[PDB]
Design an enzyme around this catalytic site. Structure first.
Site, PDB file in Angstrom:
ATOM      1  N   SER A 146       0.858  -1.192   0.000  1.00 61.52           N
ATOM      2  CA  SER A 146       0.000   0.000   0.000  1.00 61.52           C
ATOM      3  C   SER A 146       0.891   1.238   0.000  1.00 61.52           C
ATOM      4  O   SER A 146       1.743   1.360  -0.892  1.00 61.52           O
ATOM      5  CB  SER A 146      -1.043  -0.102   1.109  1.00 61.52           C
ATOM      6  OG  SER A 146      -2.046   0.881   0.935  1.00 61.52           O
ATOM      7  N   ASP A 254      -7.963  -2.347  -7.341  1.00 63.44           N
ATOM      8  CA  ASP A 254      -7.501  -2.167  -5.975  1.00 63.44           C
ATOM      9  C   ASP A 254      -8.528  -1.367  -5.178  1.00 63.44           C
ATOM     10  O   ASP A 254      -9.045  -0.354  -5.654  1.00 63.44           O
ATOM     11  CB  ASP A 254      -6.169  -1.433  -6.001  1.00 63.44           C
ATOM     12  CG  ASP A 254      -5.608  -1.237  -4.642  1.00 63.44           C
ATOM     13  OD1 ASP A 254      -4.979  -2.169  -4.128  1.00 63.44           O
ATOM     14  OD2 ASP A 254      -5.823  -0.135  -4.079  1.00 63.44           O
ATOM     15  N   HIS A 300      -6.971  -5.628  -1.674  1.00 66.57           N
ATOM     16  CA  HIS A 300      -5.978  -4.621  -1.302  1.00 66.57           C
ATOM     17  C   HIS A 300      -4.880  -5.281  -0.486  1.00 66.57           C
ATOM     18  O   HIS A 300      -5.167  -5.873   0.560  1.00 66.57           O
ATOM     19  CB  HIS A 300      -6.620  -3.490  -0.495  1.00 66.57           C
ATOM     20  CG  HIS A 300      -5.684  -2.357  -0.212  1.00 66.57           C
ATOM     21  ND1 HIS A 300      -4.929  -1.760  -1.197  1.00 66.57           N
ATOM     22  CD2 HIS A 300      -5.377  -1.720   0.941  1.00 66.57           C
ATOM     23  CE1 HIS A 300      -4.196  -0.798  -0.659  1.00 66.57           C
ATOM     24  NE2 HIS A 300      -4.453  -0.752   0.635  1.00 66.57           N
TER      25      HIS A 300
END
Ligand SMILES: *[C@@H]1O[C@H](CO)[C@@H](O)[C@H](O)[C@H]1NC(C)=O
Ligand SMILES: C=CC(=O)N1CCc2ccccc21
Length: 356
Positions: A146, A254, A300
């Protein structure tokens, strides 16, 4: 609970609130592979939204409450059953406590309520690890998820330059960027940047860079120039400027990308077209990324999830693709692919996607 906390000996390299930054380490004697993983967790870009993050996300701004140990999971696991790829490596988890996408180089001071030192935290961790065995490494894989994945893109070449200048040209620095390859695309529903929730990623990063004293890789900075460094936080723009080998892991749909695009999931035509176009644009940006793993899923992050081994693209798992990447860095390899991008156009068109 196998990774042990070490707070930085240089206590001037700090989390947001001035507490020392640090890292969790599990050494593997005899392995010359080192995995340094950058945690993610959004960011904050002004006093008001950083103050709110300090109230209810304080572990992302301070080490005061960090536990003495953490369990390595996924790619940080030392069990081959969970981590077919690098289970015997030296494992480092670097907590994200700078809220700056790992880009900052500013201390708390008379004029700054918070320190944003993400770029310096990485440099200091590397420095202190050299005395703990990293000096003998053959490969240093800088990985992250991330905001940590974007942090890999922003920092991998600086780690490489740091080790070169310190006299360790034999350490091969490589990057693994998971879920950090974002598009500066049109939102599905539009909002001018009037507060935190309405502020699109390009604007928030523009503000954050000035607020954080954020730094970007030199070649990318030279292309975009002063005032436009925000461009370097977008993978498809910064990646072509990088010298270190970087493997890119990115879900085509995502969830963080969809969030910043103001998409919240019976889908009608406009949203269907929007989602299909997003997957196609993401696929396009990866066409010339030779080492990549991009499944057609709504999800994610992947690399530190315990079941990271489950997803496959074209019949190849991510641990296998990473192993094939290692072999390629010793012409393509028979049955050992490294470029794995789904072509089907809708989330979960790949049957191996995470169930949620
Ligand atoms: C501590 O870190 C700061 C910030 O990176 C750096 O300026 C300073 O030289 C470091 N000091 C030592 C003793 O490593
Ligand atoms: C998951 C949030 C996150 O980390 N985001 C959202 C958009 C963006 C652009 C550049 C770097 C990071 C991020």
């Amino acid at each position: 609970e196998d990774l042990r906390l070490h707070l930085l000996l240089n206590t001037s390299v700090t989390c947001n609130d001035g507490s020392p930054a640090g890292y969790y380490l599990k050494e593997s004697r005899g392995s010359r592979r080192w995995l340094l993983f950058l945690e993610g967790g959004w960011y904050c870009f002004n006093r008001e939204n950083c103050d709110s993050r300090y109230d209810t996300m304080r572990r992302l701004m301070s080490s005061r409450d960090w536990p003495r140990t953490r369990t390595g999971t996924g790619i940080l696991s030392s069990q081959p059953e969970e981590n077919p790829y690098w289970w015997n490596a030296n494992m480092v988890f670097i907590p994200y406590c700078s809220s700056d996408v790992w880009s900052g180089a500013s201390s708390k001071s008379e004029k700054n309520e918070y320190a944003f030192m993400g770029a310096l935290i990485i440099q200091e961790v590397v420095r202190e690890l050299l005395g703990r065995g990293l000096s003998g490494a053959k490969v240093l894989l800088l990985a992250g998820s991330s905001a940590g994945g974007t942090g890999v893109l922003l920092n991998v070449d600086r780690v490489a330059e740091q080790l070169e200048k310190l006299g360790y040209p034999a350490i091969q620095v490589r990057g693994l960027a998971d879920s950090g390859w974002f598009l500066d695309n049109k939102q599905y529903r539009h909002t001018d940047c009037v507060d935190t929730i309405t502020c699109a990623p390009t604007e928030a990063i523009r503000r954050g860079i000035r607020y954080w004293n954020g730094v970007v890789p030199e070649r990318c900075r030279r292309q975009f120039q002063e005032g436009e460094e925000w461009n370097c936080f977008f993978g498809y723009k910064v990646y072509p400027t990088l010298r270190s080998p970087v493997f890119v892991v990115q879900w085509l749909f995502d969830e963080a990308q969809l969030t910043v695009d103001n998409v919240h999931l019976p889908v009608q035509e406009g949203l269907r077209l929007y989602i299909q176009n997003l997957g196609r644009e993401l696929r396009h940006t990866l066409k010339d990324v030779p080492a990549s793993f991009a499944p057609a899923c709504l999800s994610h992050e992947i690399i530190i999830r315990s079941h990271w081994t489950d997803v496959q693209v074209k019949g190849t798992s991510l641990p296998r693709a990473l192993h094939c990447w290692d072999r390629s860095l010793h012409t393509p390899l028979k049955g050992c692919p490294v470029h794995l991008v789904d072509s089907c156009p809708w989330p979960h068109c790949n049957p191996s996607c995470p169930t949620g």
